[PDB]
Design a protein around this ligand. Structure first.
Ligand SMILES: [Cl-]
Ligand SMILES: [Cl-]
Lengths: 659, 659
């Protein structure tokens, strides 16, 4: 082998294949190259007939590996070979491995690619690296899918229904696939991922300029590679996560930085990234935000209430719209009867035109003075208030619909024809906001704003116009929120509505929620439940029992999101959130989520520690379980140590009243 | 126009296009032909270049429409034209429309197709027929997707989060697609579907010999057709369901029979089908089953308990496997402490080999005598008992794994390499069951059996071997169940585990559960909740509150499916099922589900009436709502009128106990 080495790592590079292993010297843990095919990389490209095929670059006609500097090895893979034995002449991939001279940190970069008369598409590089061996390694893959998850590398006790679905998925196509960076769908919210066992951890951080996808393989033995051939896989069940470099699209630097952490797990990974997040400029603390705007302290302990009037979808829809008097009375009841001390009231349906014309205040719902009376009541209670706003939609049912503000592609065709909520080109969105937002703020005396859609993702197309809008909104210095968010938007907002979990998502049945994003960013952005999956709805992500406990563990706020006709049914949930979640949310709001742990074999009992001095232990399953010191946590129960040393213990119960 | 007419229907057939309208003469409602393109049919076929294209068959070069009998119109569509104006010379499609002389029934059949030098694939015929106009018709599409759903043709009040998902799905690809018949995944469990408004209903029943797919379009304006062109749809939002004849594979008769019901809805449609089910031989009543086997009377009021010991997935898995003494104690606790009077105990993990070798009784778990003691205990209480059995798997982790009993295709390649649970060719399965099942029956004195996997679907490949196993099992005259089921298997079993709902399914955000299967088959086959989504798990399909109420409305039994370590956490739910669900299940078990109705604008308050003289009203949402007479049904509440005149009223409560 060729060798790169420092005080912490030894990298062994195979001259013949370009594959590498990483020995973490302190533990003797060796991270292995591809256990299945000894493939350094997997490259998808067209053949001479123009059919896409995926090849092992380690089978190329020529492979050149050399040390080109003390801590750099240069590799070159020349003329890959197709399945049928023909050669992709003139195709080459060049890469570098660069060891930090001091730290346990390896940079891996794809530095050039040549396509000849072929077309190159995906490159998995390194391929099937940093794997865990299922049922040998006791650890997990770590994936910042929205708030984040882990995927254990072994089978463990769990509810029998869940166990069937989990195990089964590890033998079919549910456990393999890919995810993308910085969307509000199924994708990742931070540019890293990793694997750990009981000895060591590795993560990879993707260069800021690049947008690889991430391939996963969760305990799968690769049977998916053999089904079309009708044979059984000869490979072993493993866990891996690989970068997919999109060679046909990517113009950035195709670099991933691997960090090796002895005895580390997902918390340690998160903290490594937190330092990078700060270097990248995303980290603007809620303490800095509170210094700029004292009204940010209306957020700790506040329930986020969304009163959904059928808008933006419809204007004054019968059986859904609220009047402004009705809004006022919901506000009053929240404060006077349900004793809610702090709240963020978000009223969906206050305008008589469709977004993106967020005006005038609707005469049919009572007019301006009647809305002002609602808002003033809220402000009298120290609640925050915002209308629903959006500057990105262009809706088919809007009488003012036009394609004039939609974007066109290089061929002159309309973009986002199938995505109605994100049709207005961002380059127009600041101008739309400017039409009325300052009038609303002046007329209502607003202290807060929430703006939908535009900041839910961080794609390249249109980003300049989105930044312009973000800066415009931020210039008002209101306590402000937006739908979902991404790390890149943290500087401009105080809270994100969402950054939790989709209901139906890849990896659902073979992962556990982990507060990855909040382990990084809790001190910098507040988050609340998503409006589609609020704390009052029973979904794949739980009922109120589960959601309330998870809120405290993860450091998010309560979301009660309702049509007006449901309000009386919200009362119990509001009370329970007020009693249990709100004081914990208050105490921990500005703090760091220092650590999170799973404390039971089924992963349902967890412990979170916040730099406020607050410790939350909760049991998200139905059966009491013991942890350390033989302490028992009831099903759907909690034990919380507050800053002041007091202890709160308790549990939820579901009962049946029979008359 | 050519007309077919009787006293109930007028069929108006356009002689230039082949499109037809149907006037239902009692209500006067007119079902229109394709509102979008005036297409009589949509045919997918390869072009001169071999690229598949879809074409409107009404644009064919020659269309021949003639009245060939009093009540038959014959159509021929000759030389379809491609996008580019080129012709598919030698291609033709012939159809017939046959009006029943007396009844409001129309048979539609594709009687011939010729391909010439082209290859034909899908044919939608009739295309976009029997549609509902969104927000003008107040009705629904009716789809027997597993237990069944309806898809309303208008927007209505509901929870705000649900509303956003619902409306949004009508404008993207979530509201269009296709489903297949007789699978245990996303598909249909009865060969019919339909549409209704406030005046009239139509359904179509597919010929017994055919396997069309079904296309859906739920309030979608056809934007999916235009996204690639980057233009806005010019079509209106409508609801339709079309048959998709797979011309490349279908050997049966491509006939659908349309039945027209003035004032009808999904209940009337289910009852039309019920007549056809009986004609097809699927309907063997529970009453007949009870006459054959008096032990069937151990099912009414019984909780289905699955004790999941990590088998079949693993043998004797630490932390999941139960011993036979442990199983005995669980059974004892359920009866003596939790006062469950009737139950079906299903123990997953009683053998020391992997399925499909369902023997011997495991020595490691205690041996035959200790299993007998647990079974005898169960029998002394009157409970039904089965071990887990399966004759279809061939598992990678089984030391005895071989490919010898796997099916191979015409190229000699293994089939089902991707489906571990369904690998043994059905032709072998009877033999595998024969190896030990009679030894088990005799040793344990079994009164019952549940067999997993084999009867979850009704596919053509392997059907004969499945039938042979069903008949073999049924020859024992045991109270018996199977996973999921299908209508074709009703004659052989007393119960099905499942026939409810997938958690993640197409149409989930744009449909309501409706008890379609049970509206047809409740008197013939009992069902219970699916082990993956049991009444103790909180999922997309609800928590215990919601599941228990739906169980009573739809006429299914309770499923408690748990790993042994969870048992103590099951107690409250077992109690509540005992007190609430079990007596209603007991009373209604053999009865007809006569009617189901949605009584609230949000579809959450419902009413079912059983021929036992039992009426169940329940509210599956959080807020109290009023029905007729101003009677209020509490959130998560019920009002049940029993045959004995008694009225049961009550509701679930979730409380927080702070110590
Ligand atoms: Cl969360
Ligand atoms: Cl159900």
């Amino acid at each position: 082998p060729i060798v790169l080495e420092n005080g912490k790592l030894n990298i062994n590079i195979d001259s013949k294949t370009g594959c590498f292993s990483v020995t973490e010297k302190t533990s003797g843990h060796v991270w292995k190259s591809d256990p299945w095919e000894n493939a350094a990389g997997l490259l998808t490209l067209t053949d001479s007939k123009g059919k896409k095929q995926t090849v092992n670059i380690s089978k190329s006609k020529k492979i050149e590996v050399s040390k080109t500097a003390k801590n750099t090895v240069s590799l070159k893979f020349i003329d890959p070979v197709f399945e049928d034995g023909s050669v992709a002449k003139g195709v080459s991939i060049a890469t570098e491995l660069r060891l930090d001279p001091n730290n346990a940190q390896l940079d891996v970069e794809v530095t050039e690619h040549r396509s000849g008369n072929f077309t190159l598409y995906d490159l998995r590089y390194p391929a099937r690296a940093f794997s865990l061996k299922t049922d040998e390694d006791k650890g997990a893959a770590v994936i910042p899918q929205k708030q984040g998850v882990i995927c254990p590398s072994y089978i463990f006790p769990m509810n029998g229904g869940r166990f069937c679905k989990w195990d089964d998925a590890t033998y079919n196509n549910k456990s393999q696939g890919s995810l993308e960076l910085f969307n509000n769908g199924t994708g990742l919210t931070m540019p890293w991922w990793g694997t750990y066992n009981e000895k060591s951890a590795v993560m990879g951080i993707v260069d800021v300029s690049a947008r690889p996808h991430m391939q996963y393989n969760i305990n799968n033995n690769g049977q998916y590679l053999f089904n079309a051939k009708g044979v059984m896989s000869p490979y072993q069940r493993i866990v891996f996560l690989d970068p997919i470099w999109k060679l046909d699209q990517e113009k950035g630097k195709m670099r991933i930085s691997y960090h090796f952490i002895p005895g580390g797990d997902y918390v340690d990974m998160a903290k490594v990234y937190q330092k990078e997040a700060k270097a990248r400029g995303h980290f603007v603390s809620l303490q800095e935000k509170l210094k700029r705007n004292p009204n940010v302290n209306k957020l700790p302990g506040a329930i986020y209430f969304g009163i959904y009037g059928g808008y933006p979808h419809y204007v004054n829809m019968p059986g859904m719209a609220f009047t402004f008097d009705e809004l006022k009375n919901i506000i009053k009841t929240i404060h006077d009867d349900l004793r809610v001390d702090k709240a963020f009231v978000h009223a969906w349906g206050t305008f008589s035109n469709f977004v993106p014309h967020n005006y005038p205040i609707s005469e049919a719902l009572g007019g301006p003075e009647k809305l002002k009376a609602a808002v003033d009541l809220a402000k009298s209670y120290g609640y925050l208030y915002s209308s629903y706003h959006a500057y990105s939609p262009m809706l088919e049912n809007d009488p003012n619909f036009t394609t004039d503000l939609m974007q066109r592609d290089a061929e002159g065709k309309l973009m986002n024809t199938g995505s109605r909520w994100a049709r207005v080109d961002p380059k127009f969105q600041k101008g739309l906001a400017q039409k009325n937002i300052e009038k609303e703020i002046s007329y209502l005396g607003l202290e807060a704003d929430i703006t939908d859609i535009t900041f839910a993702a961080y794609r390249e197309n249109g980003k300049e116009g989105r930044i312009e809008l973000a800066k415009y909104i931020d210039s008002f210095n209101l306590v402000n929120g937006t739908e979902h968010g991404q790390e890149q938007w943290i500087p401009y907002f105080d809270m994100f509505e969402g950054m939790t979990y989709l209901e139906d998502r890849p990896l659902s049945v073979i992962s556990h929620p982990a507060p990855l994003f909040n382990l990084v960013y809790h001190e910098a952005i507040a988050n609340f439940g998503k409006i589609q999956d609020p704390d009052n709805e029973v979904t794949a992500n739980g009922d109120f029992r589960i959601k309330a406990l998870r809120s405290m563990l993860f450091g998010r706020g309560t979301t009660i999101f309702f049509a007006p006709y449901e309000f009386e049914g919200m009362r119990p949930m509001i009370e329970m959130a007020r009693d249990l979640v709100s004081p914990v949310h208050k105490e921990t709001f500005y703090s760091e989520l220092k650590s999170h742990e799973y404390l039971s074999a089924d992963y349902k009992v967890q412990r979170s520690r916040f730099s406020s001095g607050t410790e939350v232990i909760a049991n998200l399953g139905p059966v009491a379980q013991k942890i350390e010191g033989g302490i028992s946590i009831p099903g759907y129960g909690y034990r919380i140590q507050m800053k002041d040393g007091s202890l709160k213990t308790g549990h939820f119960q579901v009962s049946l009243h029979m008359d």
